[PDB]
Short mmCIF file of C-alpha atoms and ligand atoms in Angstrom, two decimals:
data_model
loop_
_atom_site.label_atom_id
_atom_site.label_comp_id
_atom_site.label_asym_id
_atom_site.label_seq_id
_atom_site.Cartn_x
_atom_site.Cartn_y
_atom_site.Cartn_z
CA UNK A 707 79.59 110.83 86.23
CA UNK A 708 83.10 110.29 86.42
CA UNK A 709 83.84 107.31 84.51
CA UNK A 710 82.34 104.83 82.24
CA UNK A 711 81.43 101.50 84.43
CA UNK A 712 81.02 99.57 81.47
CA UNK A 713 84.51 100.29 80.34
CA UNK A 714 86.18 100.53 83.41
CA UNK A 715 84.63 96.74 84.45
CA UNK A 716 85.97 94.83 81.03
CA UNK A 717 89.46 96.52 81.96
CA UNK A 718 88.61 95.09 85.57
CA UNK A 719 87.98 91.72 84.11
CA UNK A 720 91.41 92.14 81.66
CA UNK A 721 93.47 92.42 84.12
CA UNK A 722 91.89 89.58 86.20
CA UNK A 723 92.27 87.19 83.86
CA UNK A 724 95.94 87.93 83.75
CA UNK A 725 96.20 87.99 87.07
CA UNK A 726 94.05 84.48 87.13
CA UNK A 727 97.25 82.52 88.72
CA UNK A 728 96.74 85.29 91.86
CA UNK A 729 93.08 85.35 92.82
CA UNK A 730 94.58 86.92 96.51
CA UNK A 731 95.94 90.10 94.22
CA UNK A 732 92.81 90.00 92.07
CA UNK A 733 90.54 90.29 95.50
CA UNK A 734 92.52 93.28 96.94
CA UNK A 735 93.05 94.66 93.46
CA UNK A 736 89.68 95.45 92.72
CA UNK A 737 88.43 96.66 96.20
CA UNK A 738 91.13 99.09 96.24
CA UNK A 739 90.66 100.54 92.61
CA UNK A 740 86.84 100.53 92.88
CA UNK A 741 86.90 101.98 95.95
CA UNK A 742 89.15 104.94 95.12
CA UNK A 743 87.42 105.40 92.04
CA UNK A 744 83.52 105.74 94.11
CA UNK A 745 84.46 106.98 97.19
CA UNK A 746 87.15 109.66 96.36
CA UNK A 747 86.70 111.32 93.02
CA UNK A 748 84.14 114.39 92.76
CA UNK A 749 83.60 116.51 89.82
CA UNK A 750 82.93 120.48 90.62
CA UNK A 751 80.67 122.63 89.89
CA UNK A 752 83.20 124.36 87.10
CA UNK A 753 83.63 120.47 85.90
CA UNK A 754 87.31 120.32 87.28
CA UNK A 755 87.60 117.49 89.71
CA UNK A 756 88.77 116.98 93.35
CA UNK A 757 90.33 114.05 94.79
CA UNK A 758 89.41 113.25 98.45
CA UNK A 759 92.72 112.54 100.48
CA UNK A 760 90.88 110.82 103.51
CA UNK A 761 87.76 111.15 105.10
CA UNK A 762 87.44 115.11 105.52
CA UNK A 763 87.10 117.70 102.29
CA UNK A 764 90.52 118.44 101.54
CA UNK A 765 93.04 117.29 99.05
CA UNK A 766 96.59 117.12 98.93
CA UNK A 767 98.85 117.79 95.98
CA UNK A 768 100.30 114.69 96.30
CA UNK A 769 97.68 112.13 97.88
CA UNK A 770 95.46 113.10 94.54
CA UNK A 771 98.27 112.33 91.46
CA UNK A 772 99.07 109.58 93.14
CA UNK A 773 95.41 108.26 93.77
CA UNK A 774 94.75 108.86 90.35
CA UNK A 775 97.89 107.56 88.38
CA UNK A 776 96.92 103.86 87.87
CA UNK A 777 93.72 104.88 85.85
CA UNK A 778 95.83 106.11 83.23
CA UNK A 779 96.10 102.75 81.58
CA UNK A 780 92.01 102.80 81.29
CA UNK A 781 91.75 106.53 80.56
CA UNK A 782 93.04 105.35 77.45
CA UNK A 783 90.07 103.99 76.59
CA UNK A 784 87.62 105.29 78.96
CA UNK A 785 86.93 109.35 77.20
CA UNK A 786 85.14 110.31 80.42
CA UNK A 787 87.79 109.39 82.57
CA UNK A 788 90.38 110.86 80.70
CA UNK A 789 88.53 113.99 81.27
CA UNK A 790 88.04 113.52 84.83
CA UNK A 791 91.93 113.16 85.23
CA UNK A 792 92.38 116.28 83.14
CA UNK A 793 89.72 118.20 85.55
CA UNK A 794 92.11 116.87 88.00
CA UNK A 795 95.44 118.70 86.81
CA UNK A 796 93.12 121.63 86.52
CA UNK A 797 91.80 121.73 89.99
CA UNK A 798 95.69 121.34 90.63
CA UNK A 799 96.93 124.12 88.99
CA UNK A 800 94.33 126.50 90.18
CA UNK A 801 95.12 125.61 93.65
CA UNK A 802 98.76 125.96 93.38
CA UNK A 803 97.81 129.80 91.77
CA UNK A 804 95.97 129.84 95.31
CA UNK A 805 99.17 129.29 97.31
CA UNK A 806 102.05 127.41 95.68
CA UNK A 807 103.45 127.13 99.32
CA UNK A 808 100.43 124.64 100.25
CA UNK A 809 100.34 121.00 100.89
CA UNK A 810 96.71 120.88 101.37
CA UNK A 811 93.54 122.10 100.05
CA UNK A 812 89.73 122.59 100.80
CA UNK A 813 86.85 122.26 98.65
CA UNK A 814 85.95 125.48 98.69
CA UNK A 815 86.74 128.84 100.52
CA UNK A 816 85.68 127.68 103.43
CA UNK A 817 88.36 128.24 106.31
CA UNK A 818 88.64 124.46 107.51
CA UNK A 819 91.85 122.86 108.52
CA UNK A 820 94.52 124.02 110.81
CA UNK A 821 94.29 127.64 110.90
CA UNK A 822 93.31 128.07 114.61
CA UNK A 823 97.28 126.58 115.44
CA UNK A 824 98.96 128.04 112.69
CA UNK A 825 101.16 130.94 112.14
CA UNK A 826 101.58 131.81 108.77
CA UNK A 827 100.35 133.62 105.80
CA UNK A 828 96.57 131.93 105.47
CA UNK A 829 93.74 132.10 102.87
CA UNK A 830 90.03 130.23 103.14
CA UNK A 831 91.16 127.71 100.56
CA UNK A 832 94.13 126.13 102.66
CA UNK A 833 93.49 123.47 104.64
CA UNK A 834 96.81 122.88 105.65
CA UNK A 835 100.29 125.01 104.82
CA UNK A 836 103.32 122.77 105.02
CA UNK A 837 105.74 123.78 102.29
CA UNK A 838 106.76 120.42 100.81
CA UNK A 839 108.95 120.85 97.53
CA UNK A 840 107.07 117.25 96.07
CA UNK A 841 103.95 119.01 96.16
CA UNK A 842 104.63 121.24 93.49
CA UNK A 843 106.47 118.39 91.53
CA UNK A 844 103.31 116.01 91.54
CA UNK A 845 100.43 117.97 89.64
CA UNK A 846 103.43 118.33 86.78
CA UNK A 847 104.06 114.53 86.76
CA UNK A 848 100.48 114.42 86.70
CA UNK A 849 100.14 116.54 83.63
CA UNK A 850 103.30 115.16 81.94
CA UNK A 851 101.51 111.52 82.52
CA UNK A 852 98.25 112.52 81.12
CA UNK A 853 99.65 113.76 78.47
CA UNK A 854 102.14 110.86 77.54
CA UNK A 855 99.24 108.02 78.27
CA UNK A 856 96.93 109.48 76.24
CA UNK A 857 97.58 112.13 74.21
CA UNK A 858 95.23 114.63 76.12
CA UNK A 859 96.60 118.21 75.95
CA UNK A 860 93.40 120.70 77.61
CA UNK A 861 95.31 120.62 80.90
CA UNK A 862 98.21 122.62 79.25
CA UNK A 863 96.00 126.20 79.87
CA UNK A 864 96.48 129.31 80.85
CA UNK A 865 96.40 128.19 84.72
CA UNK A 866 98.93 125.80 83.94
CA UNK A 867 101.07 128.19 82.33
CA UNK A 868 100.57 130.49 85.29
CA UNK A 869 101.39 128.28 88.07
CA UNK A 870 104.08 126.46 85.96
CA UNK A 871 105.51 130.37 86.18
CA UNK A 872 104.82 130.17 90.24
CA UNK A 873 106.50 127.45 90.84
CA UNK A 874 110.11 128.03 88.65
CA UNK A 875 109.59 130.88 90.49
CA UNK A 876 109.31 129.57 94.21
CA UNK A 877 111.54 127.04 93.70
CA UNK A 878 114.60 129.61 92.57
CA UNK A 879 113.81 131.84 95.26
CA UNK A 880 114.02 128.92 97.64
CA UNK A 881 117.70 128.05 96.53
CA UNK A 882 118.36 131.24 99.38
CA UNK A 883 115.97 130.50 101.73
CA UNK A 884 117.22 133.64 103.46
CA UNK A 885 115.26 135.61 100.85
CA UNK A 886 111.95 133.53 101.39
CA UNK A 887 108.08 134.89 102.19
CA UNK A 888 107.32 131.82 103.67
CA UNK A 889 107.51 131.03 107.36
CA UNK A 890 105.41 128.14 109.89
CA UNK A 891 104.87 127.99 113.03
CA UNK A 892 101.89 125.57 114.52
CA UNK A 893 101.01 125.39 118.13
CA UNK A 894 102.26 121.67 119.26
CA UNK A 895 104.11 119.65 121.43
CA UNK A 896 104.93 117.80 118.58
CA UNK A 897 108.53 118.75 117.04
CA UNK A 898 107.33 117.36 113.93
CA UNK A 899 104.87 119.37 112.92
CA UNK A 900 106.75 122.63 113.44
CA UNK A 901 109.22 124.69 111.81
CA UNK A 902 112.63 126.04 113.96
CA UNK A 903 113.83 129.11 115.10
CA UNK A 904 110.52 130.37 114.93
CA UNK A 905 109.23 129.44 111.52
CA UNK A 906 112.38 129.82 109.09
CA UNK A 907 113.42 126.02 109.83
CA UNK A 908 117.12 125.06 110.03
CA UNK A 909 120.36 126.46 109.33
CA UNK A 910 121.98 125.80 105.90
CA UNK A 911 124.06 127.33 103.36
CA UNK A 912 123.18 127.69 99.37
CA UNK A 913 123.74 124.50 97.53
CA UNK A 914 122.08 124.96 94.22
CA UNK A 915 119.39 122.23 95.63
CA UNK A 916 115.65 124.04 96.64
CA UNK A 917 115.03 124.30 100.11
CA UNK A 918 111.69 122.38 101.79
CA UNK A 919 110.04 123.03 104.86
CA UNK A 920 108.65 119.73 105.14
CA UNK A 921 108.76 116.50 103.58
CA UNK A 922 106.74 113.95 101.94
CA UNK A 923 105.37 112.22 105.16
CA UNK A 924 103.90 115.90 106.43
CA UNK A 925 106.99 115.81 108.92
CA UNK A 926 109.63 118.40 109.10
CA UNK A 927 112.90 118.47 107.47
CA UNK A 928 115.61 118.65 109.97
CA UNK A 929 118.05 119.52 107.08
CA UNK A 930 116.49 121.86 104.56
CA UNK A 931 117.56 120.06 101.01
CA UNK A 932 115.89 116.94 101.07
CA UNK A 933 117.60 114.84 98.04
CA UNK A 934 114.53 112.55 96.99
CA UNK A 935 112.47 116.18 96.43
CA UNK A 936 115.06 117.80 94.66
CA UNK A 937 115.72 114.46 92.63
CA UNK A 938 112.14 114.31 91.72
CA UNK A 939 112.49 117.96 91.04
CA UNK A 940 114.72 117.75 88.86
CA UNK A 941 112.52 115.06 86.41
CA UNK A 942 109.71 117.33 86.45
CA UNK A 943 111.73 120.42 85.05
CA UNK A 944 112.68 117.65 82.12
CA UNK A 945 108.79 117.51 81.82
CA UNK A 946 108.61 121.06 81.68
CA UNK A 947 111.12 121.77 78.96
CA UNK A 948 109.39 118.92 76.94
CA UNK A 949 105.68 120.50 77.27
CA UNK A 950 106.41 123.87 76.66
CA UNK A 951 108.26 123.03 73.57
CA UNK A 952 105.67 120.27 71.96
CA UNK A 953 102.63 122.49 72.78
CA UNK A 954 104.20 126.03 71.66
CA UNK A 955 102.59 127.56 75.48
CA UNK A 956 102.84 130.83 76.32
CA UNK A 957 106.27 132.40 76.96
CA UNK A 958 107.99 128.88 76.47
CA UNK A 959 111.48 130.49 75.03
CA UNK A 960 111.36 132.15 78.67
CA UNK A 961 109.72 129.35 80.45
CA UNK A 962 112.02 126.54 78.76
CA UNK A 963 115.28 128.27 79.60
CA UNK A 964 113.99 129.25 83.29
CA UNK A 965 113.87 125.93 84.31
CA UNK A 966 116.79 124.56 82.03
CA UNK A 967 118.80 126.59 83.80
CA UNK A 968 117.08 125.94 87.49
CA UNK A 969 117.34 122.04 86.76
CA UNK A 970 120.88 122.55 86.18
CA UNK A 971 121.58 124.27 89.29
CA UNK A 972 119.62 121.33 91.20
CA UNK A 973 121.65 118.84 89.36
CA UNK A 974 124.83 120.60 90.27
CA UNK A 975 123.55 120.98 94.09
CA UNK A 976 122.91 117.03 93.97
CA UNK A 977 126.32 116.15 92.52
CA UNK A 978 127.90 118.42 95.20
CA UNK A 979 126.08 118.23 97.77
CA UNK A 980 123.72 114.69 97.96
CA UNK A 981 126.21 112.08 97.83
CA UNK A 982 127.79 110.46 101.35
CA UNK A 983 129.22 107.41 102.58
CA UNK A 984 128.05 103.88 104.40
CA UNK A 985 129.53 101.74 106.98
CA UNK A 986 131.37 99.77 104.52
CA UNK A 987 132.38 102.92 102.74
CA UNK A 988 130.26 102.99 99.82
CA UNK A 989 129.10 106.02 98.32
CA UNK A 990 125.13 106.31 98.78
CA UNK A 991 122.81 109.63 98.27
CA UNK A 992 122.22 111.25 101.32
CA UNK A 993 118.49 111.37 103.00
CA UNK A 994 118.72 115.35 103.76
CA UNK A 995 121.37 117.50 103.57
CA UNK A 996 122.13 121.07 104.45
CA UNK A 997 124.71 122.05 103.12
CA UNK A 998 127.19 122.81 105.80
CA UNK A 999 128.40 119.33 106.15
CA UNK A 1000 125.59 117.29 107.38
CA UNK A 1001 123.82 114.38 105.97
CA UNK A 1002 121.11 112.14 106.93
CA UNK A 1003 121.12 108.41 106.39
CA UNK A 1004 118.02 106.96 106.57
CA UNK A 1005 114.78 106.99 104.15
CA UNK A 1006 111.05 107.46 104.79
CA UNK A 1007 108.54 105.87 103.06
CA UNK A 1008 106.83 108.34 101.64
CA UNK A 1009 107.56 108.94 97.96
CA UNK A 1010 109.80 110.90 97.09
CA UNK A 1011 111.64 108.80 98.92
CA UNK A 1012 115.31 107.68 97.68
CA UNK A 1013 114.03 104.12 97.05
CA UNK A 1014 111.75 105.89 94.94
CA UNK A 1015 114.31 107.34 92.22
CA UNK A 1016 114.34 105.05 89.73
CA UNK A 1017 110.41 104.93 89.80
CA UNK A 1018 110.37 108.88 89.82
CA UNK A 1019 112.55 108.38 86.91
CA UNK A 1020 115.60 109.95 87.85
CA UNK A 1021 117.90 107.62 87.60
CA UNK A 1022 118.11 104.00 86.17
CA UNK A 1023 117.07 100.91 88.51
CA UNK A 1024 120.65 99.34 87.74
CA UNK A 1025 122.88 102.40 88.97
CA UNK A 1026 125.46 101.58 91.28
CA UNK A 1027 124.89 104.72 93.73
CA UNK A 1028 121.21 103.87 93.58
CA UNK A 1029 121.96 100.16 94.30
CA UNK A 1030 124.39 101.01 97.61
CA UNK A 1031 121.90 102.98 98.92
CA UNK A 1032 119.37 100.75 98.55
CA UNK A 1033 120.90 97.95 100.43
CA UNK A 1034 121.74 100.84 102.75
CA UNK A 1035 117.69 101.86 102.78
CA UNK A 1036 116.94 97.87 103.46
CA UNK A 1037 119.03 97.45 106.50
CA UNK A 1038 119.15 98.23 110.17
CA UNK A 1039 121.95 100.81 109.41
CA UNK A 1040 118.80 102.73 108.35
CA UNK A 1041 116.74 104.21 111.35
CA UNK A 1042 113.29 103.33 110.50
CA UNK A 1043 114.31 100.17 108.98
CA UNK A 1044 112.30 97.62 110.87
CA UNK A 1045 112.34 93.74 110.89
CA UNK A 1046 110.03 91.52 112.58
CA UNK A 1047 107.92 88.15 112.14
CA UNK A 1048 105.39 89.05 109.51
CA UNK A 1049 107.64 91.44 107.60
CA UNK A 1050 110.39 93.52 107.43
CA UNK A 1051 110.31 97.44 106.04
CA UNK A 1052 110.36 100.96 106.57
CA UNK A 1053 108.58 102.85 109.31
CA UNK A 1054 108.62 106.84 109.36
CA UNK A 1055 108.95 109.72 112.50
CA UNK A 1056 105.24 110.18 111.34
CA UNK A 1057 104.67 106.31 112.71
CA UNK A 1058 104.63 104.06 115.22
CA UNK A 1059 107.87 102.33 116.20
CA UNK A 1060 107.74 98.76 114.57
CA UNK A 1061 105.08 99.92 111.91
CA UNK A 1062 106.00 99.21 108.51
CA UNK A 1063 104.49 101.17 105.24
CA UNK A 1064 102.60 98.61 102.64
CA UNK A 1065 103.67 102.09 100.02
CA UNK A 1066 107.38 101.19 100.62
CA UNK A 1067 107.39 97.72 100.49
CA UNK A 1068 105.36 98.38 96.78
CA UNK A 1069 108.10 101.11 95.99
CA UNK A 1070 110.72 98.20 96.60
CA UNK A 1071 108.94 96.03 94.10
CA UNK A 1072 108.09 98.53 91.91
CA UNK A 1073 112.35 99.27 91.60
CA UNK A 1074 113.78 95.81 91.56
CA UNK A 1075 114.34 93.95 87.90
CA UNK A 1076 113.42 90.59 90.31
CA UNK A 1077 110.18 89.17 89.24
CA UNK A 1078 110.29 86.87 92.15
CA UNK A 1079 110.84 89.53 94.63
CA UNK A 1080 107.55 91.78 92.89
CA UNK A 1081 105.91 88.34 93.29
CA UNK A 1082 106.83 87.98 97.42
CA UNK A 1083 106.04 91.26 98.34
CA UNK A 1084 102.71 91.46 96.60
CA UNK A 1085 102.30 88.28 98.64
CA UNK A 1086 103.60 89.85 101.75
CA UNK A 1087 101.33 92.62 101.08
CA UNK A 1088 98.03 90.77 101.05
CA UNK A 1089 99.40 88.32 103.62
CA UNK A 1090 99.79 91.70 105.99
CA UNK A 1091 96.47 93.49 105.88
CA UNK A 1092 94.96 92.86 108.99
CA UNK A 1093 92.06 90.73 106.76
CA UNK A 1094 90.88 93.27 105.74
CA UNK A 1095 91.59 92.95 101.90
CA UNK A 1096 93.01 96.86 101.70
CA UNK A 1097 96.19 98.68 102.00
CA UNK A 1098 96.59 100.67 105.47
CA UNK A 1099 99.61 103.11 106.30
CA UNK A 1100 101.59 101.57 108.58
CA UNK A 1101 101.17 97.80 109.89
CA UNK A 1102 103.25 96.47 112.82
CA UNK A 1103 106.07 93.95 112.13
CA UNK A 1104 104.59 91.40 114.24
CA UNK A 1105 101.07 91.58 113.87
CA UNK A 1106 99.46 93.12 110.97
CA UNK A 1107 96.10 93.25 112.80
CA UNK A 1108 97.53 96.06 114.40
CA UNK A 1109 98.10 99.17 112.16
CA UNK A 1110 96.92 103.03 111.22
CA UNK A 1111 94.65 104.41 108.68
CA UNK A 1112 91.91 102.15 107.65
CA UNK A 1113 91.25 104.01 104.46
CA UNK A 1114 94.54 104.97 102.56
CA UNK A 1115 93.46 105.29 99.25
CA UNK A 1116 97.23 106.33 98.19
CA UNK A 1117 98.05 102.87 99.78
CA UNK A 1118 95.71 101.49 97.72
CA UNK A 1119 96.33 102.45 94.86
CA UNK A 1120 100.47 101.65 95.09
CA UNK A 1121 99.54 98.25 95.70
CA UNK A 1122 97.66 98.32 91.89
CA UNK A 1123 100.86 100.07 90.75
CA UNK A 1124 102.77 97.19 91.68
CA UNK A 1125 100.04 94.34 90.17
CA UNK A 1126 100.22 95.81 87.38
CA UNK A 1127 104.05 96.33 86.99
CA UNK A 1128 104.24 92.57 87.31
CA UNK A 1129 101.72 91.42 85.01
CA UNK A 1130 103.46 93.96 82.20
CA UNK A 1131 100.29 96.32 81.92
CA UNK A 1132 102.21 99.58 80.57
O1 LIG B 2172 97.40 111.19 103.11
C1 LIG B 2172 97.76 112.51 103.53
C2 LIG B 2172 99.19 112.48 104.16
N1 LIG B 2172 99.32 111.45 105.20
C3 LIG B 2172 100.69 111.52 105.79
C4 LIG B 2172 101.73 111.10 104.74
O2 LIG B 2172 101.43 109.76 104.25
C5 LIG B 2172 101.68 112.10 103.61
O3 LIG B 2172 102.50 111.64 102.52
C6 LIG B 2172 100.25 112.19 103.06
O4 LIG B 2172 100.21 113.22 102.13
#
């Protein structure tokens, strides 16, 4: 009901036999993209789709664009699954008109999730309310992907045009935070998973950049601008511009200069604001900043993440800032950089200590030019998974039988990112 399985399996078989020199890739390969494709992927009752994060009915922003990126290639032959990823943006959009401050969404109105800890403005379709400035980027990649793959154009609707609207909107009041509706607090013991001084998070001063609450790995900020966010930002108010114009939407002479002008205040808040120094001196982007003077170094594997940029497209693989930082990212002078006999890689505050992510060590091949170092870690990848032939979230350094989240389907489906970026399927 969601896809064609005769299409979908001579794609399968493509794609094997030019990947017949790696029968190891070939094995995970296909368990992870069949099972994401089964086991996560419902169509609604309005025919817009939802995208099962994990194993409980509710589905994040981000988890689902990323889940459902690598089946762009086949969408474009596959008509039924081209629809199903449109249904997706849909589902997206309608959700963000729900609550563009939410990371994660129910099925239905149905209360579930973490209401019964958490302080802040609620409705029965959140499942979770962590403001997370990526979330609001991804369902615009998503749409801007769809679009570009394929050609498909019946997510651009009046629900996209309206939550396109919500979130220049959030975004530019959240360059003054000060003037924000939003505030979290959750009853924990865990630091993480809580916003300080009693909801409105962390001091800062106005930057240009938008302020987050949280960041990609559900964690909190502990400086408000969060560089890899506002980078990825930034691309996705490109995208904007470029749909608005091509597709004559609604309002786009409005639209088109709103986030013009926002993306060039971000830009201008990066420039000034991102940028700090290594132990050798070097300039490198910063991991958070706030801007009163303080800036993280470090990365978390969660994308956006800085290794991330040049595959968010924001800046080119072969950039010298990008490059410093990088060799920055992949050392111990990084704080969740973690080396031991199996592997070394980034772990998160979300984590274990010694864990490694299997999605960062695919982000690092999917941004180096190396063929040979795409061709080790897809290795080191398959040689890590516990034998279990699927991608988990974190593994330890020292014994990959030891690691979290059985089922990752966004795991999974980084790992196909990164087959496929080697065999030249684009
Ligand atoms: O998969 C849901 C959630 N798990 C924790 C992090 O990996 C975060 O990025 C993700 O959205």
């Amino acid at each position: 009901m969601v896809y064609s399985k005769e299409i979908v399996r001579e794609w399968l078989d493509e794609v094997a036999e030019r990947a017949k020199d790696y029968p190891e890739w070939v094995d995970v390969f296909e368990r992870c993209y069949t099972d994401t494709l089964d086991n996560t992927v419902e169509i609604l009752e309005d025919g817009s789709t939802f995208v099962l994060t994990g194993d409980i009915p509710a589905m994040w922003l981000r988890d689902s664009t990323a889940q459902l990126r690598p089946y762009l290639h086949v969408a474009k032959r596959d008509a039924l699954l081209r629809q199903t990823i449109a249904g997706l943006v849909k589902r997206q959009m309608t959700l963000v008109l729900k609550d563009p401050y939410a990371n994660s969404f129910n099925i239905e109105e149905n209360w579930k999730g973490h209401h019964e800890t958490d302080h802040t403005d609620l409705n029965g379709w959140i499942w979770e309310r962590k403001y997370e400035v990526d979330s609001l980027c991804y369902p615009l990649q998503l749409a801007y992907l769809l679009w570009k793959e394929t050609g498909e154009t019946s997510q651009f609707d009046e629900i996209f045009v309206a939550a396109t609207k919500e979130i220049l909107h959030l975004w530019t009041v959240e360059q003054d935070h000060k003037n924000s509706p939003y505030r979290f607090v959750r009853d924990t013991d865990r630091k993480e998973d809580t916003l300080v001084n009693d909801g409105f998070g962390p001091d800062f001063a106005v930057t240009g950049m938008t302020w987050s609450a949280f960041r990609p790995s559900d964690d909190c900020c502990q400086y408000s601008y969060l560089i890899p966010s506002n980078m990825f930002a930034v691309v996705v108010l490109g995208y904007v511009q470029e749909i608005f114009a091509a597709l004559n939407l609604a309002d786009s002479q409005s639209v088109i200069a709103d986030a013009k002008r926002l993306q060039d205040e971000i830009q201008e808040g990066i420039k000034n604001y991102a940028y700090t120094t290594n132990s050798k001196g070097e300039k490198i982007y910063a991991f958070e900043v706030d801007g009163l003077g303080n800036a993280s170094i470090m990365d978390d594997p969660n994308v956006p993440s800085l290794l991330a940029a040049p595959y968010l497209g924001y800046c080119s693989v072969d950039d010298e800032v990008y490059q410093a930082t990088r060799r920055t990212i992949l050392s111990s002078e990084n704080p969740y950089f973690y080396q031991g006999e199996y592997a070394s890689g980034l772990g998160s505050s979300h984590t274990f200590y010694r864990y490694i992510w299997p999605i960062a060590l695919s982000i690092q091949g999917l941004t180096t030019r190396d063929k040979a170092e795409k061709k080790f870690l897809l290795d080191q990848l398959v040689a890590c998974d516990g034998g279990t032939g699927v991608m988990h979230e974190s593994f330890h350094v020292d014994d990959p039988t030891l690691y979290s989240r059985e089922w990752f389907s966004w795991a999974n489906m980084m790992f196909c990112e990164l087959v496929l970026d080697y065999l030249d399927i684009r």
